[PDB]
């Protein structure tokens, strides 16, 4: 009797009745609407608001047109109820599109510009919901709603503020719409609302400004008109709200795309905040902050200040984040940005443990991380004063097998590093040891790169052979007398 399993599996699903968007009920409300009698229309509006409040689905033209018609009313009750109904229906994705196609934006804008704060709230909110569909965003942005949205973002009523700033946020997702926002004058408002004591408003405005900072032109504009923006974001890095912390950090990263902001964030005291955030052991916070410091470390004038601030060891520790490839990449990239600085910073770099950790990661990490590490080694090897030390950390053990990689960032930078390590060093012991190992070591490298199609690789091989000859060493001169090496020409 397996059947009685099935017998109750069906009844169950026959369960999985409150639908009134058609037939009798709908016709009754519609009849109330087209009566053009004020009281009856009030009744219809209240009914619609309640119904949409309790249940929402994709509805047809005949549901939305009586509501749109109710939105032409001068009566506050009708207005607020109809706006509530349309706003509720605008939670469904097909409804958003249909509502905008029917010309709902014009009545909504009109209702926004009236002196009724509840109607303001509901109309703005309806627009907020409409703007969560990509198709609608540009149409809303160019419809004229931006001026009243910007104005209403300054409302003393927190619900109106949330809806307004939310809509503004919903139109920072494309370059064009962001341009529309900046042209409508939203930026001073957003910046001012960075100080808001409401978590939602603060988050919306922080995120909105962060998205606005994605565009170079907006960054330039902000640099000219909003001089205290960096300070405010910096102070927002210490917000008790985690998402506001994270987003403020992201905004600072985005801004740090530019040189001037790279200097300005440091000048405004952002470094200790970043130092703390990069050690939070919260993946979002760490990601944001390591990205930010990655951008900031590009400016030479910051290097010293970054090392004094104590970034090196936190950065090095980030390399143990084996389940976050991006964090590893950014950490290593920042380290490499700190790898060709002054002597003090160099000593600090070597005292951080970056070389050893990078060596450890070089042969057991994603190819992106490998690439960053390889580049880091390549730049580190440029300093003569460091070469021996790099050699005594046995990084040749990493470099040599990396010259086998089909990723040319890896292999190319490994070749560069190795080559430079072979040049003008006082002691060639480590090089002699690594002549045949690992994996044919340095001689094998020389062979393979001597027969390379890519003229740069071949140039590298020839150049490092020359550097090996150039140095006054008796034995490496003995080791180059092997026939696979020489007749290459």
């Amino acid at each position: 009797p397996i059947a009685d399993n099935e017998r109750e599996a069906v009844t169950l699903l026959l369960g999985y009745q409150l639908d009134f968007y058609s037939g009798g009920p709908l016709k009754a409300l519609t009849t109330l609407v087209y009566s053009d009698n004020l009281n009856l229309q009030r009744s219809a509006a209240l009914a619609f608001a309640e119904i949409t409040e309790k249940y929402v689905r994709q509805v047809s033209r005949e549901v939305l047109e009586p509501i749109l018609i109710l939105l032409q009313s001068q009566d506050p009750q009708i207005q607020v109820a109809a706006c509530a109904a349309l706003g509720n229906l605008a939670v469904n994705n097909e409804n958003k599109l249909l509502i905008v196609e029917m010309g709902g934006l014009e009545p909504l804008i009109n209702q926004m510009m009236g002196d009724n704060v509840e109607v303001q709230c509901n109309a703005v909110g309806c627009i907020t919901n409409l703007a969560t569909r990509d198709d609608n965003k540009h149409k809303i942005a160019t419809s004229g709603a931006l001026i009243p949205l910007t104005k209403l973002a300054k409302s003393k009523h927190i619900r109106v503020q949330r809806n307004a700033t939310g809509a503004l946020l919903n139109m920072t997702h494309s370059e064009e719409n962001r341009k529309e926002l900046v042209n409508a004058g939203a930026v001073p408002v957003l910046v001012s609302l960075l100080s808001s004591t409401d978590p939602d408003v603060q988050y919306y405005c922080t995120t909105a400004l962060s998205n606005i900072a994605v565009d170079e032109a907006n960054r330039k504009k902000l640099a000219q008109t909003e001089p205290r923006l960096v300070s405010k974001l910096v102070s927002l890095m210490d917000s008790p709200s985690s998402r506001v912390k994270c987003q403020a950090t992201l905004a600072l990263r985005n801004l740090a795309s530019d040189t001037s902001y790279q200097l300005e964030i440091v000048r405004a005291g952002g470094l200790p905040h970043l130092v703390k955030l990069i050690q939070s052991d919260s993946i979002p916070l760490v990601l944001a902050s390591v990205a930010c410091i990655r951008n900031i470390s590009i400016h030479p004038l910051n290097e010293g200040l970054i090392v004094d601030a104590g970034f090196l060891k936190p950065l090095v520790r980030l390399l143990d984040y084996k389940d976050s490839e991006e964090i590893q990449c950014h950490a290593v990239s920042t380290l490499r940005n700190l790898a060709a600085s002054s002597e003090k910073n160099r000593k600090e770099f070597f005292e951080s443990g970056a070389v050893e950790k990078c060596k450890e990661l070089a042969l057991d990490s994603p190819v992106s991380v490998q690439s960053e590490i390889s580049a880091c080694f390549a730049i580190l090897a440029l300093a003569d004063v460091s070469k021996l030390d790099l050699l005594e950390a046995n990084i040749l053990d990493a470099l040599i097998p990396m010259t086998f990689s089909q990723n040319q960032e890896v292999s190319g930078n490994a070749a560069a590093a190795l080559a430079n390590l072979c040049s003008r060093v006082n002691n060639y012991t480590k090089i002699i040891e690594a002549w045949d190992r690992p994996n044919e070591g340095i001689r094998g490298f020389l062979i393979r790169f001597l027969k390379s199609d890519y003229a740069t690789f071949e140039h590298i091989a020839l150049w490092t052979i020359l550097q090996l000859l150039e140095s006054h060493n008796d034995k490496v001169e003995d080791l180059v007398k092997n026939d696979d090496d020489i007749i290459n020409g």
Binding site: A45, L46, A49, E53, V80, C83, A84, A85, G87, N88, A90, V91, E118, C121, V124, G125, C126, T128, N129, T132, R159, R162, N163, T165, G166, L169, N170, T172, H173, Y204, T207, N211, V214, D215, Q247, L250, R253, N254, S257, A291, R294, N295, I298, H330, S333, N337, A340, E372, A375, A378, I379, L382, E409, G412, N413, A416, A419, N420, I460, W463
Partner: peptide, 30 residues
């Protein structure tokens, strides 16, 4: 001829990222 370098000294700046999280309205009173 003094050194070999196949990568830029500094690494590239990251592209600014957009947060695509969407805001929704507050509950509607009527």
């Amino acid at each position: 001829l003094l050194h070999i370098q196949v990568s830029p000294t500094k690494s590239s700046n990251l592209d600014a990222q957009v947060n695509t999280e969407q805001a929704y309205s507050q509950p509607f009173r009527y």
